[PDB]
């Protein structure tokens, strides 16, 4: 309400004049993605020009879709956050942090007349990345089933949860974080869960719902130049 009849407030008394457009001093900074992802171009961002610019860049998290990074609609429902950690000449660089799904997909997965099994494990990568994974699965009915529901016994849920947990620790421990991502993209880990738990109970909709990085080497500089595959200046005259 900006109308005249609106009652006056205290804060309207003293107001600074607009005399500087912030975007005059802002400087754009281009962001890049690891070599694990096909499309390294993931947009661009801006910061106030250095009076530095780098400190605000470091730790800046941005989230972009896998379909954009991999150019395939099959990954439309997955998220990966980018905290910038090394800067070169307007370019921002990263090596993996974390992952998640979309809300609409997760709601699309939850359905009536079936059982949900959710397993979470805290485990470290070979590169000392302490991370937390969340895996979700749903019971399914056989081809010839006549029962409406495909509910599983609590013992089946506990047995399947143990199998999921063992696999998640095994993949994470015996792999680097960069290698772990190379597993996340093709969903090879999800296929592994189906077959280990195939004997226990027929399942559907197996996915790793979320990945968190608890304690950290970073989304980082160290292995960055190797993962991403220095520069002399130009004379001023």
Partner RNA sequence: UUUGGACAAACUUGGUCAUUUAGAGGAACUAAAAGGUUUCCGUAGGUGAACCUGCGGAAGGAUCAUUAAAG
- List residues binding RNA (CB under 7 A): 140-141, 143, 204
Residue 60 near which of RNA, another protein, none (CB within 5-8 Å, type-dependent): another protein
Asked if residue 14 lies in contact with residue 36, where contact means CB atoms within 8 angstroms, the answer is no
Sequence-ordered alpha helix ranges (H) in 102-153:
103-109
Asked if residue 163 lies in contact with residue 119, where contact means CB atoms within 8 angstroms, the answer is no
Closest CA to 66 of 94, 101, 93, 95: 101
Q: Which is nearer to RNA, 144 or 154 (CB)?
A: 144
CB of 121 to another protein, least distance (A): 19
CB of 108 to RNA, least distance (A): 10
Q: Which is nearer to RNA, 122 or 204 (CB)?
A: 204
Residue 226 near which of RNA, another protein, none (CB within 5-8 Å, type-dependent): none
The tokens of 122 are what? Answer: 């805290």
CB of 133 to RNA, least distance (A): 23
CB of 151 to another protein, least distance (A): 20
Distance (Å, whole) CA 12 – CA 132: 49
Residue 47 near which of RNA, another protein, none (CB within 5-8 Å, type-dependent): another protein
Query: Checking DSSP bridges between strand 99-101 and strand 78-83, what pairing results, if any?
Result: antiparallel
The tokens of 125 are what? Answer: 């990568």
């Amino acid at each position: 309400a900006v109308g005249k009849n609106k009652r006056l407030s205290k804060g309207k008394k003293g107001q600074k004049k607009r005399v500087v457009d912030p975007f005059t001093r802002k400087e754009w900074f281009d962001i890049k993605a690891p070599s694990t992802f096909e499309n390294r171009n993931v947009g661009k961002t801006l910061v106030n020009k250095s009076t530095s610019a780098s400190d605000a860049l470091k730790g800046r998290v941005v989230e972009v879709c896998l379909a954009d990074l991999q150019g395939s609609e099959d990954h439309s429902f997955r998220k990966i956050k980018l905290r910038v950690d090394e800067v070169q000449g307007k370019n921002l660089l990263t090596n993996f942090h974390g992952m998640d799904f979309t809300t609409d997909k997760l709601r699309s997965m939850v359905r009536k007349w079936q059982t949900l099994i959710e397993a979470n494990v805290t485990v470290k990568t070979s590169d000392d990345y302490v991370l937390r994974i969340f895996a979700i699965a749903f019971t399914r009915k056989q081809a010839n089933q006549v029962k409406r529901h495909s509910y599983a016994q609590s013992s089946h849920i506990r047995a399947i949860r143990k199998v999921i947990s063992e696999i998640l620790t095994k993949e994470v421990q015996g792999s680097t974080l960069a290698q772990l991502t190379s597993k996340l993209i093709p969903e090879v880990i999800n296929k592994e869960i189906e077959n280990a738990t195939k004997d226990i109970f027929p399942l559907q909709n197996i996915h790793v719902r979320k990945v968190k990085l608890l304690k950290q080497p970073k989304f980082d500089v160290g292995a960055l130049m190797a993962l991403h595959g220095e520069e002399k200046g130009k004379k001023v005259t």
